[PDB]
């Protein structure tokens, strides 16, 4: 008895959970009211473990005791060159244990803990499970979980193992771009079609060329950039306001961490607002040395600050086409995935790359992966 199976997007930066109820997919909001949840862990001084928004939102001078981006490490060996490169950029300690890159943090009272990447991912799945259980009013035991198309055997198995730790029987692992296609019902079509999935997220960018024939998907080619997404657009805005503040006041903002943390949170909020309005205000009381911060950002300035990065996303699309032996006119469906595809300019540039062809529309792009997982979960719940 699998009960109500949940569909989970276990994301590098943001995760999402959905279920099939009363004849449709329902994307479930967490206890902070959000339909996506940061893949983030932290600790209080008392040694309480925070997960999700509360973890990411906790003001700290000790980023070395937060954990995030565990998906970059999951199912890999310590000596994997990808791991050895990624640990340069992660503020928390990673140590070799049982051949793997375990995460070592202080959690309160001088207590040290060491966690496998799949134990961190298990904490995130637990939070997703709790989110679904609160919505459903009952326990959940089974899940469909998505992974990037490029995940190998160890990465898939380690994702299943994270489920096991979280008390979730991972019944099916499905590829993220495929899950998005399923969300749009592209599996339920006749003839053979070429689908280009453009997935621009928080820290990661994935482009995938899928074919669909008689209900069966094949991932023909993949590309992208493992360190390009909305976090980078935020940093460009940060640099803009840090330089302006120095020019204005003479002071170097970066000397104070919690200040940088406050500006980052407000910059991210502003960026999101600018996907649906043309100006946003950034305001922070007691920003730096007792002085308040108050500035505006226009959509045009946001675009100007990131135009080169926005344009760089086309190169991996051109590469998957060449690797697929396809031209632009061979693409039958374009699917936008990832939170950063909410950016109007990103939509515009993809459409222009495809000579005016409209993408699929109607599912929030940061939810589309979980949506498709939930579709499959619906069938499995019966
Ligand atoms: N309305 C929006 N406008 C611009 N960016 C957004 C919007 N909503 C979410 N984002 C960005 O999407 C990114 C997260 O993408 P998502 O696909 O949810 O994460 P992941 O890459 O971890 O799967 C973040 O940088 C977030 O700031
Ligand atoms: Mg994603």
Numbering used by the authors: 26 to 407
Task: Quote the study on this structure.
Full-length GRP78 consists of two major functional domains, an ATPase domain and a protein/peptide-binding domain. First, there is evidence for the relocation of GRP78 from the ER to the cell surface in numerous cancer cells, where it has roles in promoting cell proliferation and metastasis (and references therein). Third, engineered agents that fuse a cytotoxic agent (e.g., a apoptosis-inducing peptide or taxol) with a peptide specific for the protein/peptide-binding domain of GRP78 can bind to cell-surface GRP78, become internalized, and cause cancer cell death. This finding raises the possibility that, similar to the protein/peptide binding domain, the ATPase domain of cell-surface GRP78 can be developed as a novel functional receptor for delivering ATP analogs across the cell membrane. Therefore, we studied the ability of GRP78ATPase to interact with three ATP analogs (i.e., 7-deazaATP, AMPPCP and 2’-deoxyATP) and the known substrate/product (i.e., ATP and ADP) by using surface plasmon resonance and x-ray crystallography.
To confirm that we can introduce the substrate ATP and its hydrolysis product ADP into the crystalline form of GRP78ATPase by using a soaking strategy, we grew the crystals of GRP78ATPase in the absence of the nucleotide (nucleotide-free crystals), and then either ATP or ADP was soaked into the nucleotide-free crystals. Unexpectedly, soaking the crystals with ADP resulted in the active site containing electron density for an inorganic phosphate (Pi) and Mg++ in addition to ADP. A possible explanation for this observation is that Pi and Mg++ were co-purified from recombinant protein expression E. coli cells and co-crystallized with GRP78ATPase. Therefore, the ADP structure of GRP78ATPase appears equivalent to the structure of ATP hydrolysis products and will be referred to as the ADP-Pi-Mg++ product structure. Superposition of the metal-free ATP and the ADP-Pi-Mg++ product structures shows the γ-phosphate of metal-free ATP is found ~3.4 Å away from Pi in the ADP-Pi-Mg++ product structure (an Cα-RMSD value of 0.43 Å). Alternatively, the Pi in the ADP-Pi-Mg++ product structure, while still coordinated to the bound Mg++, is located in a pocket formed by Thr37, Lys96, Glu201, and Thr229. The ADP-GRP78ATPase interaction was as strong as the ATP-GRP78ATPase interaction in the untreated condition, as indicated by their similar Kd values. However, the ADP binding affinities were significantly different upon the addition (23-fold greater) and removal (159-fold lower) of Mg++. Therefore, the ATP-GRP78ATPase interaction seems to be insensitive to Mg++ concentration, whereas the ADP-GRP78ATPase interaction depends on Mg++ presence at the active site.
